[PDB]
Design a protein around this ligand. Structure first.
Ligand SMILES: O=C(N[C@@H](Cc1ccc(F)cc1)C(=O)N1CCC(O)CC1)c1cc2cc(Cl)ccc2[nH]1
Ligand SMILES: O=C(N[C@@H](Cc1ccc(F)cc1)C(=O)N1CCC(O)CC1)c1cc2cc(Cl)ccc2[nH]1
Ligand SMILES: *Cc1c(COP(=O)(O)O)cnc(C)c1O
Ligand SMILES: *Cc1c(COP(=O)(O)O)cnc(C)c1O
Ligand SMILES: OC[C@H]1O[C@H](O)[C@H](O)[C@@H](O)[C@@H]1O
Ligand SMILES: OC[C@H]1O[C@H](O)[C@H](O)[C@@H](O)[C@@H]1O
Lengths: 815, 815
């Protein structure tokens, strides 16, 4: 067989040029050949798929080319391990990064179809809970845009974050069957399935330890392409799916599902640790399969050069088993000596911390680890012993420090502190905001910082400007481009140039206009899909994020109730109208969080139907908050609420989204809020409340909520209203749990920041009364948000942690 | 929006002409765009998929057109309900019916690929157990070829018939993960999902009965196209998949699998009834979803015309719940009166019986029916009461007949006789071979025949000549075409013309040559994938079918052991060399059937390694017998074994496959064997053993195997060898169960036909010694097999049962 004949098999002239004529042809081809529909039975969903497939074709030509390029060039490869990847919709984002948006628009118009209507049909890819998952998605976009040889590795959950329904004011969870109609963006690779072992036992042979009598679960990869911004670079996100091996009969076949349950559903916990066996299996699963893939890719073009060609970033402690698993492979399978293996491991792994809340920290009981992963538990003990020996050498006689630094936590239930394991086996450990990274060195990891100061870094979070500006706010992106060009899209610092238009009356008018249109649009979307009338001329007060006590949605609730009581007291007095919007999902077993949602809706029940309040105050709970809803509500927001208790929000990222889209911020000196105020100037920020140091003082002396209740009349009245059943007539004591918590067991001191919060809210209302000055402060914000682009964050990881150089060099097009 | 613009959305000029240039282009497009592979990483499996997708495109253009045609013309529609559809591979069959085989061959050659190698990569679609399932597949092909508006409705099992492995001579079952790499021939239709109810209870309202508090399981359809032979007609096979509805949290999501288990696996029972709940659910599932689809299609272009536009064929009693379900819908939902509903039902349904073995008959316990389908059990009782009233009117005072005809079978465990239910609610009941249909009227359904003689018919089975001749035996099809043309392919009766070449020396040489090549090929396939050396010059004695006592593979075993003992007795005597091949799967819990397989391999262990036997005798057990293996071994067979006990094989179809491909038959006067001998002339058939009437005599007086053991020395010796451990040295009494069964509990009288069988086998050996006369008898067989084409069978169903006229009119091509 002449092998020169197989040279015809090329992607050289396939998709055709990116003009309207070829696009319509392919749209048609896909509608008929791919979907087996005709113009008579086709529905809008079918038309949406035909378009997705048409765009996908252009995406694939570049995908194949990018991977060929990396094979030829062999760059250092970056592996981002995360159990979450909150991707959202992919159609629009693909059209924009490939510059096909226009042609697709024209091509769909000539066919008698409306592209915007089609885009709304796409299901959100919700394989994440919130901030942690979305950050991974932003980073993927940025790494592609910066031309890095990066791969995202995670789990392909069959069911992502649940869909939230509100019944009688309460949250109801519904499985998110996001694959029901299929996913055109993923490419299954059954041919690359790998084995993952569980349970079993350890045997010691003359030449080493052997992990035997193990149960096997296969890991099947699904690849999703991730396009960079107009540089023709398409990277890969590989998600693993669990499959049972082929080795009563009927029962035996039905029991296969048991093994496939590993990748069935995403744990809906945000910043909270649940030590369930299934979760541990998910963690080892993603890790074991990923590392095998990494080693084989490494051997296909000894291990001394491993750290030079491989960088493994651990997103939180979820994939922390990668450290002992890498040791297991190198020592048990590759037979390297312990010390060389360890050196390679530390040089390859880096760890990112995302929270300081103690209940969010993973501490796995050893009895669970010894039955499920016996060999890893042995390796962990060894790692521990050698690490503790170093400690003892650096701090002789300090037996207390040894106890505190141990990877093994004593107590009735022995547990492994995964955070300690990550610090010990990583060459770098980073926080996600300046204040958070400092807190890590000053508090929780102080002992580790003293032993190895060089390991601790900071990498302030960011968001991608493509999805969080160009995509969700085309109007804003339009008027900004009409003055400074399109170069900011991949270089956000250029937004700085906008400071020269702070005084231009044309610009001021435009910014205010884009926002009004965004608000008009959002108000329409609300009446259409959730029938209710909000006044588009009111101030849009928005707080959207996962429901959590530390995020203090309750502090927000206290404010709106204060506003209501005020109006009722002096009904004929003028107040700046407000539409307070709060949305977010609560973890299913988080009782307090679910009670907070009920409180929010109970408040709206009273406020929204009080005739004397009128159109002056509306409280709305946005149900099913997700990436696609964030893209709608954020560009329409005037005020962004970032009011977590100082020292609790590691960074936050939603705050940055609001800053980039023309909303002013009211928040505490927490996480990235500190750096945002720093960039825009504290005078262009609505800061309030305790600083981290004040919180420490209060803690030292003791928090007594009663003091505030006794000293603040307005607060007393609110609490009295809550306990009396004012907001729950048929059930007088429905909120007894919330009240009791605020009064006697509030770890986040809501009452302590109440007074400052309200006063601050008053200044917000004062400034909104003056349109031109409000819009001018907004411009001072948008103009200095450049530092919060994920491209900046990634550039820093690359250079300071991974040892690779970014690049905006575009690759050639398929043809 | 101008709706005239949407006229551009057409299949009018898509696939391009069927020439080599366009095919290569599409092959390439699919390899890259569809599979995301390039010529560097692509494997033969990838190349196979690129080709399948290329061929699929041509198949889809016609599919859309055919369905448009039926919409416009609105023919009477035929619905074939079956729980099995043994389809086998689809690539080659599609290329042949579309006449693309050649272009595909040339196009793949110019790309440096070999098409035959690619075809072998396709997985068999094994959604059937054997004869019953394969008949449904043959019928689908025939109905399409005869231009009937027919739809096959079944279940999309995730795992079909298990893969058979032989370990130490024993059968081992391995799940058949046939969807692992995907199925390019199916088109999922999530948009057409329908609800199916289970359990619940019946409430009586003033206006009727209501089935309430039911558990719901969704039914998602997957469509597979079925192309007719070169007539551009593409029909549909719709298979249902079970999906849970979207309404601890983690556990709740994991428990969804419970509902999806309904379509997880095919029960591997052939001609045997297992009353398990899961199986009953599968039966109602396919029925409830199918009938809903049928009603909606009916209303989209009152019920008095239902029987004029709808025909529902029940393949065995598996889908028998269609009768009470149709009544439930018409009476409970559509609110028709009982009598009108009943008339419509009987006029719409027809039932086909496939076996008389009592243990194969479905008799569901009422306690299972009342808890799972309470409303259907009520309807069944009502049907029963009104049917029994008719009986009482026609045969006054005959209380015994009333007991025998009842749909409800008394006893400790009350049961519903589904066969009786089908006869009562169908306008037609048919057997599958002349002798079988007569047995139905004479024995098991005698009471029903006496009440309604007009209901009973016969429809002798057939096989499709496309797959069973053109596809598997191109050489034979070639030489046949070179003398009489290609018109026989869709008109098998024309094979008759071949009787004029019985004396032509050229033809005789050719037929013998095609067979030798087929044998040479099969011998090569055996050494390559199952390393073992058979002599291609020996007589190929083949018996392939499911292992069953009534099929008497044991009678075959007795013969080969006799042959072995004979050789050993007179080693230097000449015998016609033979390669005895036996293959087939045994149901997992069928102990005796699994013991028979072990016996067969034990026999080969001794015979195949006896140096004095040499190349004169080889016993081979063909593992994992399936549709694709049948296509290989059948064309290479010389002698076809169809030796079931007279009166037990309803028809058989494998017998017809062997007849069409040049093998002579040695069998009993059973099932279709009777009609085959009738067509070829009994002198061209090797018939032997008891006739049905002889079996009855023996039964009347009593079967005593000892008599034969006492009177036949050769038989004694065999039994003595078996009990002594001659064939099982390390385990002397391993076959004690088989021996005991043959001696004291043989329901199929193996010993009674032993003597006649051996004598007959001797005549087979005598004729093979004379090549020219052997080949001339073969020609007399091939030439009269025309009557056994499924096109003939379907034509008869259409005209005599469905009321529709066949047609070979070709539809226009897509363009
Ligand atoms: O899914 C894709 N192609 C099909 C091509 C296809 C379709 C049916 C089939 F049977 C085999 C292959 C496929 O490989 N899978 C379909 C689902 C199946 O279970 C596994 C394979 C796909 C191509 C592609 C290109 C890009 Cl750029 C992005 C996502 C993509 N997905
Ligand atoms: O499978 C086909 N097309 C894809 C086209 C496609 C691919 C990916 C996707 F997300 C949506 C649609 C599809 O509709 N399914 C893929 C698997 C998914 O789970 C359900 C839909 C298909 C077209 C076709 C035409 C013919 Cl003639 C025969 C079989 C066929 N199958
Ligand atoms: C950005 C984002 C988050 C993170 O928001 P924070 O306010 O930082 O907690 C959570 N959910 C969604 C859907 C997001 O888009
Ligand atoms: C034709 C066929 C059958 C039916 O064979 P019989 O000898 O009639 O029992 C069974 N299995 C397969 C794979 C077939 O092709
Ligand atoms: O690091 C991304 C996100 O991780 C977690 O969600 C933290 O709670 C949040 O502060 C941070 O912004
Ligand atoms: O009807 C098709 C087939 O059904 C069953 O398998 C019967 O056992 C067989 O005799 C018949 O040929």
């Amino acid at each position: 067989s002449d092998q020169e004949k197989r040279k015809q098999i090329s992607v050289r002239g396939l998709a055709g040029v990116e003009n309207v004529t070829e696009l319509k042809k392919n749209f048609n081809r896909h509608l008929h050949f791919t979907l087996v529909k005709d113009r008579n039975v086709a529905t809008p969903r079918d038309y949406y798929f035909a378009l997705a497939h048409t765009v996908r074709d252009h995406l694939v030509g570049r995908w194949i080319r990018t991977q060929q390029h990396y094979y030829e060039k062999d760059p250092k490869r970056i592996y981002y391990l995360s159990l979450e990847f909150y991707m959202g919709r992919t159609l629009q984002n693909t059209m924009v990064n490939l510059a096909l948006e226009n042609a697709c628009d024209e091509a769909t118009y000539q066919l008698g179809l409306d592209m915007e209507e089609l885009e709304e049909i796409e299901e959100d890819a919700g394989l994440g809970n919130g901030g942690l998952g979305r950050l991974a998605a932003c980073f993927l976009d940025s790494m592609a845009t910066l031309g890095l040889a990066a791969y995202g590795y995670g789990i392909r959950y069959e069911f992502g974050i649940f869909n939230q329904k509100i019944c009688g004011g309460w949250q109801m969870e519904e499985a998110d069957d996001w694959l029901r109609y299929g996913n055109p963006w993923e490419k299954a690779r059954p041919e690359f399935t790998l084995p993952v072992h569980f349970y079993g036992r350890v045997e010691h042979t003359s030449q080493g330890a052997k992990w035997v009598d193990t149960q096997v679960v296969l890991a099947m990869p699904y690849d999703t392409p991730v396009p960079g911004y107009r540089n023709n670079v398409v990277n890969t996100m590989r998600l693993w799916s669990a499959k049972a091996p082929n080795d009563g009969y009927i029962q035996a076949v039905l029991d296969r599902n048991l093994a496939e349950n590993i990748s069935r559903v995403l744990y809906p916990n945000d910043n909270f640790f649940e030590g369930k066996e299934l979760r541990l299996k998910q963690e080892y699963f993603v890790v074991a399969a990923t590392l095998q893939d990494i080693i084989r890719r490494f051997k296909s073009s000894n291990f001394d050069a491993f750290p030079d060609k491989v960088a493994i970033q651990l997103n939180d402690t979820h994939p922390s088993l990668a450290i002992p698993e890498l040791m297991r492979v190198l020592v048990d399978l590759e037979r390297l000596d312990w010390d060389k293996a360890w050196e390679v491991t530390v040089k390859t792994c880096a760890y990112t911390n995302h929270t300081v809340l103690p209940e969010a920290l993973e501490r796995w009981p050893v009895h669970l680890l010894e039955t499920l992963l016996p060999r890893h538990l042995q390796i962990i003990y060894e790692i521990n012993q050698r690490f503790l020996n170093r400690v003892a050498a650096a701090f002789p006689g300090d037996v207390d420090r040894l106890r505190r630094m141990s990877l093994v936590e004593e107590g009735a239930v022995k547990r492994i502190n995964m955070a300690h394991l990550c610090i010990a086996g990583s060459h770098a450990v980073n926080g996600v905001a300046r204040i958070h990274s400092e807190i890590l060195k000053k508090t929780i990891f102080k002992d580790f910082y003293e032993l190895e100061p060089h390991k601790f870094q900071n990498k302030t979070n960011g968001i991608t400007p493509r999805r969080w500006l160009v995509l969700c706010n085309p109007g804003l992106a339009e008027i900004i481009a009409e003055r400074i060009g399109e170069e900011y899209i991949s270089d956000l610092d250029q937004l700085r140039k906008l400071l020269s238009y702070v005084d231009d009356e044309a610009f001021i008018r435009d910014v205010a206009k884009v926002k009004q249109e965004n608000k008009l649009k959002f108000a329409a979307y609300l009446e259409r899909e959730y029938k209710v009338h909000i006044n588009p001329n009111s101030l849009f007060d928005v707080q959207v994020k996962r429901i959590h006590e530390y995020k203090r949605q309750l502090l927000n609730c206290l404010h709106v109730i204060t506003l209501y009581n005020r109006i009722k007291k002096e009904p004929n007095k003028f107040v700046v109208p407000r539409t307070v919007m709060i949305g977010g999902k609560a973890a299913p077993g988080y009782h307090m969080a679910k009670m907070i949602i009920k409180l929010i809706t109970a408040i709206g029940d009273v406020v929204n139907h009080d005739p004397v309040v009128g159109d002056r105050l509306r409280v709305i709970f946005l149900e099913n908050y997700r990436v696609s809803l964030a893209e709608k509500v954020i560009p329409a927001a005037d005020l962004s609420e970032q009011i977590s208790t100082a020292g609790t929000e590691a960074s936050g990222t939603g705050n940055m989204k609001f800053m980039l889209n023309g909303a002013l911020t009211i928040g505490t000196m927490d996480g990235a809020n500190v750096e945002m105020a720093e960039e825009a100037g504290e005078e262009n920020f609505f800061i309030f409340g305790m600083r981290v140091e004040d919180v420490d003082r209060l803690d030292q002396r003791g928090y007594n909520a009663q003091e505030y209740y006794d000293r603040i009349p307005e607060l007393r009245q609110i609490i009295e209203q809550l306990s009396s059943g004012f907001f729950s007539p048929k059930q007088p004591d429905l909120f007894k749990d919330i009240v009791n918590m605020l009064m006697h067991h509030d770890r986040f001191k809501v009452f302590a920041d109440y007074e400052e919060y309200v006063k601050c809210q008053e200044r917000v209302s004062a400034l909104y009364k003056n349109p031109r000055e409000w819009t001018r402060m907004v411009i001072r914000n948008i103009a200095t948000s450049g530092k919060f682009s994920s491209d900046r964050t990634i550039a820093q990881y690359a250079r300071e942690i991974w040892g690779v150089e970014p690049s905006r060099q575009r690759l050639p097009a398929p043809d």
